[PDB]
Amino acid sequence: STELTVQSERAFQKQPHIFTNPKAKANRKTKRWYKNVGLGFKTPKTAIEGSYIDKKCPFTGLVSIRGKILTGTVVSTRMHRTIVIRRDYLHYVPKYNRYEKRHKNVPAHVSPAFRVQVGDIVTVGQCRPISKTVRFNVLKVASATGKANKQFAKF
Amino acid sequence: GRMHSKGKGMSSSAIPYSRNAPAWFKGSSDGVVEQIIKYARKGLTPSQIGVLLRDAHGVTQAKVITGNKILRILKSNGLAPEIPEDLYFLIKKAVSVRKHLERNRKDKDAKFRLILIESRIHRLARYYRTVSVLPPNWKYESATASALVN
Amino acid sequence: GKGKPRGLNSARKLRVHRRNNRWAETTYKKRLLGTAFKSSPFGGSSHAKGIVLEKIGIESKQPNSAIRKCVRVQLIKNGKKVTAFVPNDGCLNFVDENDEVLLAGFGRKGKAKGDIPGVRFKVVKVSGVSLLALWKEKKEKPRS
Amino acid sequence: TRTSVLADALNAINNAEKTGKRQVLIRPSSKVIIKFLQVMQKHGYIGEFEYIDDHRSGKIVVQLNGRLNKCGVISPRFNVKIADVEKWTANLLPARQFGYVILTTSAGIMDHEEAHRKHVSGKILGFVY
RNA sequence: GAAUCUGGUCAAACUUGGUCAUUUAGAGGAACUAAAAGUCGUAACAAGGUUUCCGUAGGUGAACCUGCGGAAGGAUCAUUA
RNA sequence: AGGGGAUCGAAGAUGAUCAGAUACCGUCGUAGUCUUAACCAUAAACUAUGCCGACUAGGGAUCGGGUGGUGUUUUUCUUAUGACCCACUCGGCACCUUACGAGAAAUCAAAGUCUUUGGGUUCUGGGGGGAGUAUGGUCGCAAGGCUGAAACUUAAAGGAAUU
RNA sequence: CGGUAAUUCCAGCUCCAGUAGCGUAUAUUAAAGUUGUUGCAGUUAAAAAGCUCGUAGUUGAACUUUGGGUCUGGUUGUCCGGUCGGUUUUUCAACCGGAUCUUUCCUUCUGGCUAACCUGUACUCCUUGUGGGUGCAGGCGAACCAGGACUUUUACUUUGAAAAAAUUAGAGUGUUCAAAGCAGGCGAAAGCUCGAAUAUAUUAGCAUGGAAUAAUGGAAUAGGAC
RNA sequence: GAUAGUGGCCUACCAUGGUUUCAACGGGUAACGGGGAAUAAGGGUUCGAUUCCGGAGAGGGAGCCUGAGAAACGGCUACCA
Ligand SMILES: [Mg+2]
Ligand SMILES: [Mg+2]
Ligand SMILES: [Mg+2]
Ligand SMILES: [Mg+2]
Ligand SMILES: [Mg+2]
Ligand SMILES: [Mg+2]
Ligand SMILES: [Mg+2]
Ligand SMILES: [Mg+2]
Ligand SMILES: [Mg+2]
Ligand SMILES: [Mg+2]
Ligand SMILES: [Mg+2]
Ligand SMILES: [Mg+2]
Ligand SMILES: [Mg+2]
Ligand SMILES: [Mg+2]
Ligand SMILES: [Mg+2]
Ligand SMILES: [Mg+2]
Ligand SMILES: [Mg+2]
Ligand SMILES: [Mg+2]
Ligand SMILES: [Mg+2]
Ligand SMILES: [Mg+2]
Ligand SMILES: [Mg+2]
Ligand SMILES: [Mg+2]
Ligand SMILES: [Mg+2]
Ligand SMILES: [Mg+2]
Ligand SMILES: [Mg+2]
Ligand SMILES: [Mg+2]
């Protein structure tokens, strides 16, 4: 998520082993490293052009997307740089030949390359453990604008 | 079979088979549209306008002649109200009840009725939010409701 | 109609409802509360050994009349006191005070048998030897 | 609320048959219902049926020969898994020789025999004999 | 490079309290069941000899009785004009 | 807790009746009955029949509305209403006769369209007692309410009909 | 059952059942449609909340490509055994597919191989021929890849891949039979040789075919599509 | 910082989140989990300490040495019993 400033805390935040030689002056002035995650997913222009940092970004950081790729609706954005994803499914109870509606919340990491509101459907990829509960990293946000084009009813 | 009473009635208008304009009716769709617009300007709700059309003029149904429903037409011209008509009416009704209650307190039947009305309004509100006719946060209370009414 | 929900996604309700209902079925209740361990003189076991306190004749319920010849026993495992019927015509004079006795249930699953009121247990073995054996004169009681 | 239309139709048909009538008036009318009727027709449980256009939902007039002794929907459309069809057949049908379990598969609406032949399965609908 | 030793760290345990859980003595008290040749009536079943019930309140030796409202599971499917 | 307090009347007095009779019957009679602010949340709060929807069988009634009758009367001349009269129609409170369906039967146009078993749903029951008790919550100023056991006990308790 | 004829006690004799076994106790399963998803009850037997509102839950009208035709693969019945109890076609069938054409795209190209003739460049090895093919500039690409470009998202169902062995179902096999075991079998009885199969488990994940059913999404300040 | 390495695993500074009527949390289990077992129309119900596979533990709790591998107990150190 980030939210403004970039150079905002006690330590200088830089991409490790990326050097921006302060003698021969470049076009970008500071070199930005990125990679494409693969699996058919696309690295956004917000990630390449941006000034944000993140070690835990799947594009500009050090984590690698591998294993399971899940999808679900966003429940909570409140905690910084991460998210909560609800993941509705049907559990088959065999005795009654019917289905229970079930739940399971997946906490996931949000790269500051994304604008995520509560209720957006999000594609999330598995990676190396990031915190106590997080194993997943947001790859694609599917709800793009909602109705930000024509919000007002007047023709 | 009704929504808040034990009532079971089936009284309703029965729309005819033919979508096409009735053979006896002349005029023009444009004319009809103009009339509708005029009515809207004057300050009438869709239903009222429709009724007027049915009665004073040769209009059976607006969709039969023009190709569009009255509300749609209103919207197109930029005349459809801030609150949908039915909802507004409901709100007004609720307000009246509230006013009555304010005056006389021991009317328990009235109070009961008010609750029903409120519930109905809430239902309608929910529907509207889902359809996004109302702004998706619009709530109904008391003072606010009164303000809306007036 | 029909009181239950039917819809293809009901499942949970069907489960929970069934669970709730199950508690009205007495055996199930017994199993789940564990009343075989907490209450009941035998600790949910098929047999129990006890020490004979005294020999008590018990008057049967109605239609019938006869002194039944039972024994007041205190069980070794917990210390609970129970009445135990001594089967067959002689047999009561095989028992004696301060004697170790092996008691089974009566055959009603905790309930009292026939006409003998408040008695839920048989006497099977006195001082290590079967009552039946004694009765048939196949073995002898090896003192106490 | 009219929760199931097909069910209603089937019940009506059953009622008509039991009382000995030679024709029914089904009132809401759907695609599914029509398909069901067609299956019956094919198997000869029903005569000529016709769809009145109301410009709203529909209305079906069905001729009954008298051979149909029970329709019947099985309501919460259970997902039947090929090897499971047999069990259903055993349950619902009065014999092993005749009668049909109508089940909606992705290959279309058909009787169980047809499904077997085609090697498809899906959700159950109803039964006829 | 041993004894020894300064700070940590993990941390068994111990002293006095508090707390939750399960047990356990238990002066007394209030129950219910079983056995149904004790005592006082006869409450209910017949219009049960004041029709029964029910909610509730009071009263009583005990069934119970008496208000106020209700119900036939009532002893009435019944009085046109 | 105020106001009201005519009647009727738990308690009480009190006169009979009875072996007893602080019971029925008689005469009085505080509280209550009425009301204003609070509370209470239960009744055989019963149609002892949950709600929504579809379909199956006739028959008259009746209430509310609406249609068509050169139908009757009203009369201030046509009238126009109104009230009737007939016929149809939706909605209601019911009822009558048959069930070809149900059901243990009493009975039921639903209590029908269920071993030819699946329209959608909420709640409740699982032998009789113990017991709507014990306990723990919780709500009540209180009476109480909602929630609610077990040990133990027992071969029956019950339903509808029969002579 | 037993209070003086006890078919029920205690014995004797007969007889019945199971039998190297049979009884008793306590669980537990079937019986139990007495836990009910299949599949129960609730007017009177236990049971419909006093009544209404109401969030979750469960459930929820109908409606978008249907119809035709043209060929073309099978697969069993038939029509004879055309045959040395088995095997090949036709007269024929229903049944399951495939390609199309019907106002029809089935994701689209940036290219690789364009298999093939839509071809026609010399026209003929040659029965009087449009039987047949040495043969290459324009070019049908589905015969496959290797890369984009993004693909409404499910539930459901399909075939496949995985669900250790033992256990279970089950093929083979005279442990003398059987429970078992994975052995064995055939010789000249000089050495040779079958074996040690298959099938299940559905919950979840993976793969693919399907597009009925059930849901979701798109163009209404068009900031829509080419 | 620590670790073989990921990680509130721990530390500092900061933010206020995370889970929950689709039962969180708590309580119970006379609970090791599974393969499986008993029953046996179909659906189920009950059991699985136990020969195979996982996991724990060596009276209870800690703490470590040696080592590729142990927080080992037919190794050691302590405390409690
Ligand atoms: Mg209706
Ligand atoms: Mg409603
Ligand atoms: Mg009496
Ligand atoms: Mg009396
Ligand atoms: Mg009763
Ligand atoms: Mg008195
Ligand atoms: Mg007196
Ligand atoms: Mg008096
Ligand atoms: Mg009540
Ligand atoms: Mg009731
Ligand atoms: Mg009971
Ligand atoms: Mg009776
Ligand atoms: Mg004798
Ligand atoms: Mg059982
Ligand atoms: Mg029952
Ligand atoms: Mg009852
Ligand atoms: Mg639908
Ligand atoms: Mg086997
Ligand atoms: Mg344990
Ligand atoms: Mg277990
Ligand atoms: Mg185990
Ligand atoms: Mg154990
Ligand atoms: Mg030991
Ligand atoms: Mg150790
Ligand atoms: Mg040892
Ligand atoms: Mg060891």
Domain extent listing, chain A = 1-155
Q: Which two tokens stand for residue D85?
A: 């069809």
Residues contacting residue C99 through CB under 8 Å, at least 6 positions apart: C51, C52, C126, C127, C144
Residue A115 C-alpha to ligand 8 middle, in angstroms?
Answer: 87
Sign of CA dihedral D94, D97, D100, D103: positive
Residues contacting residue D71 through CB under 8 Å, at least 6 positions apart: D10, D11, D13, D14, D40, D126, D127, D128
Domain B81-150 belongs in CATH node 1.10.287.10: yes
Cβ of residue C31 lies below 7 Å from strand H: yes
Residue C62 C-alpha to ligand 3 middle, in angstroms?
Answer: 29
**Is C24's Cβ below 8 Å from some Cβ in D?**
no
- The separation, in Å, between residue D115 CA and nucleotide G215 C1' comes to 25
- Report the neighbours of D using a cutoff of 3 or more CB pairs below 8 angstroms: C
Closest protein residue to G59 using CA and C1' atoms? C7
For D41-99, strand residue ranges (E) read 49-52, 59-63
User: Residue C129 belongs to what H/E stretch?
Assistant: strand C129-130
Question: In angstroms, what CA-CA distances link C129 with C51, C99, C139, D69, D113?
Answer: 14, 12, 8, 71, 70
Q: Which nucleotides of G are covered by protein (CB under 7 A)?
A: 1-3, 9-10, 24-29, 34-42, 48, 52-55, 57-64, 95-97, 149-151, 153-159, 201-205, 209-214, 220-223
Task: Say whether the A–C interface has 3 or more Cβ pairs within 8 Å.
Answer: yes
Q: Which two tokens stand for residue C66?
A: 């006869």
Kindly report the backbone phi and psi dihedral angles of residue D59, in degrees, each rounded to the nearest multiple of 5, phi listed first.
Answer: -175, 125
Packing angle of the helix pair B29-42, B70-77 (nearest 10 deg): 70
Q: Which residues of C touch A96 (CB under 8 A)?
A: 10-11, 14-15
Contact assignment for A155 to B132 by CB distance below 8 Å: no
Q: Which residues of A touch C22 (CB under 8 A)?
A: none
- The separation, in Å, between residue B58 CA and nucleotide F72 C1' comes to 40
- The separation, in Å, between residue B92 CA and nucleotide G225 C1' comes to 44
Question: In angstroms, rounded to a whole number, what is the distance separating the alpha carbons of residues C59 and A73?
Answer: 76
What Å resolution does this PDB entry report? 3.5
Query: Which residues in 66-105 of chain C line strand F, with CB less than 7 A from it?
Result: none
Q: Which nucleotides of H are covered by protein (CB under 7 A)?
A: 6-9, 13, 15-23, 29-30, 42-47
Q: Where are the domains of chain B?
A: 26-80, 81-150
Question: Which technique?
Answer: cryo-EM
Question: In angstroms, rounded to a whole number, what is the distance separating the alpha carbons of residues D108 and D114?
Answer: 10
Residues contacting residue C89 through CB under 8 Å, at least 6 positions apart: none
Question: In angstroms, rounded to a whole number, what is the distance separating the alpha carbons of residues A109 and A74?
Answer: 12
Question: In angstroms, what CA-CA distances link C50 with A36, C78, C104, C123, D47?
Answer: 80, 10, 11, 10, 82
Question: In angstroms, rounded to a whole number, what is the distance separating the alpha carbons of residues B73 and B71?
Answer: 5
Number of H helices, E strands in chain A: 1, 7
Q: Which two tokens stand for residue C28?
A: 């199930």
Contact assignment for A147 to B78 by CB distance below 8 Å: no
Number of H helices, E strands in chain C: 4, 6
DSSP code, position C59: B
Neighbours of A30 (CB within 10 A): 11
Residue B122 C-alpha to ligand 13 middle, in angstroms?
Answer: 90
What chain D holds in terms of domains, given with CATH numbers, is 1-68 (3.30.1370.30), 69-129 (3.30.1490.10)
D124 closest CA partner among A93, A89, C2, C8 = C8
Contact assignment for A154 to B78 by CB distance below 8 Å: yes
Residue D70 C-alpha to ligand 25 middle, in angstroms?
Answer: 76
- In DSSP terms, A124 is beta-bridged to A70, A138
Contacts 24+ apart (CB under 8 A), D4-10: D4/D73, D4/D75, D5/D29, D5/D30, D5/D32, D5/D33, D6/D30, D6/D32, D6/D33, D6/D36, D6/D73, D6/D125, D6/D126, D7/D73, D7/D75, D9/D33, D9/D36, D9/D60, D10/D36, D10/D71, D10/D72, D10/D73, D10/D126
Nucleotide whose C1' lies closest to the alpha carbon of residue C118: E34
Residue B85 C-alpha to ligand 26 middle, in angstroms?
Answer: 84
Residues contacting residue A16 through CB under 8 Å, at least 6 positions apart: A55, A62
Q: Which two tokens stand for residue B57?
A: 């003029």
Give Rg (Cα) of chain B. 19
Cβ of residue C38 lies below 7 Å from strand E: yes
Question: A120 in helix, strand or coil?
Answer: coil
Neighbours of B75 (CB within 10 A): 15
Question: C56 in helix, strand or coil?
Answer: strand
Question: In angstroms, rounded to a whole number, what is the distance separating the alpha carbons of residues A53 and A50?
Answer: 9
Question: In angstroms, rounded to a whole number, what is the distance separating the alpha carbons of residues A49 and A62?
Answer: 18
A1-155 CATH choice from 3.40.50.2300, 2.40.50.1000, 3.40.605.10, 3.40.1030.10: 2.40.50.1000
Assess contact for B121 and B93: CB atoms under 8 A: no
Q: Which two tokens stand for residue B75?
A: 């919207």
- In DSSP terms, D39 is beta-bridged to none
Q: Which two tokens stand for residue B54?
A: 């049915």
User: Residue C16 belongs to what H/E stretch?
Assistant: helix C12-22
The parent domain of residue C137 ranges over 1-144
Question: In angstroms, what CA-CA distances link B78 with A154, B46, B63, C39?
Answer: 6, 13, 19, 80
Kindly report the backbone phi and psi dihedral angles of residue D63, in degrees, each rounded to the nearest multiple of 5, phi listed first.
Answer: -90, 130
Q: From edge to edge, which strands make up the β-sheet containing D23-26? A: D23-26, D59-63, D49-52
What value, to the nearest 5°, has the Cα angle with vertex A121 and ends A115 and A122? 70
Question: In angstroms, what CA-CA distances link A60 with A18, A28, B121?
Answer: 11, 16, 51
Packing angle of the helix pair B108-131, B85-103 (nearest 10 deg): 150
Cβ of residue C24 lies below 7 Å from strand G: yes
Question: In angstroms, rounded to a whole number, what is the distance separating the alpha carbons of residues D3 and A142?
Answer: 34
Per residue, what are the HEC states of B46-96? HHHHHHHHHHHCCCCCHHHHCCCCHHHHHHHHCCCCCCCHHHHHHHHHHHH
User: Residue D87 belongs to what H/E stretch?
Assistant: helix D85-92
Q: Which nucleotides of F are covered by protein (CB under 7 A)?
A: 36-38, 50-57, 90-92, 101, 112-114, 116-127, 150-155
- Report the neighbours of C using a cutoff of 3 or more CB pairs below 8 angstroms: A, D
A146 closest CA partner among A109, A121, A127 = A121
User: Residue D103 belongs to what H/E stretch?
Assistant: strand D100-105
Question: In angstroms, what CA-CA distances link C117 with B70, C81, C85, C103?
Answer: 88, 16, 11, 17
Chain centre to alpha carbon of residue C61? 19
**Is C21's Cβ below 8 Å from some Cβ in A?**
no
What value, to the nearest 5°, has the Cα angle with vertex D29 and ends D23 and D33? 85
Kindly report the backbone phi and psi dihedral angles of residue D52, in degrees, each rounded to the nearest multiple of 5, phi listed first.
Answer: -75, 135
Assess contact for C54 and A132: CB atoms under 8 A: no
Query: Which residues in 78-137 of chain B line strand F, with CB less than 7 A from it?
Result: 105-106
Question: In angstroms, rounded to a whole number, what is the distance separating the alpha carbons of residues B23 and B136?
Answer: 45
Question: C73 in helix, strand or coil?
Answer: strand
Q: Which residues surround ligand 1, an ion (CB under 5 A)?
A: B 1
Cβ of residue C43 lies below 7 Å from strand E: no
Q: Which two tokens stand for residue B130?
A: 């889902």
Question: A155 in helix, strand or coil?
Answer: coil
Contact assignment for C9 to A101 by CB distance below 8 Å: yes
Question: In angstroms, rounded to a whole number, what is the distance separating the alpha carbons of residues D95 and D105?
Answer: 23
C67 closest CA partner among C51, C75, C55, C50 = C55
Question: In angstroms, rounded to a whole number, what is the distance separating the alpha carbons of residues A150 and D98?
Answer: 60
DSSP code, position C113: P
**Is C8's Cβ below 8 Å from some Cβ in D?**
yes
Cβ of residue C61 lies below 7 Å from strand E: yes
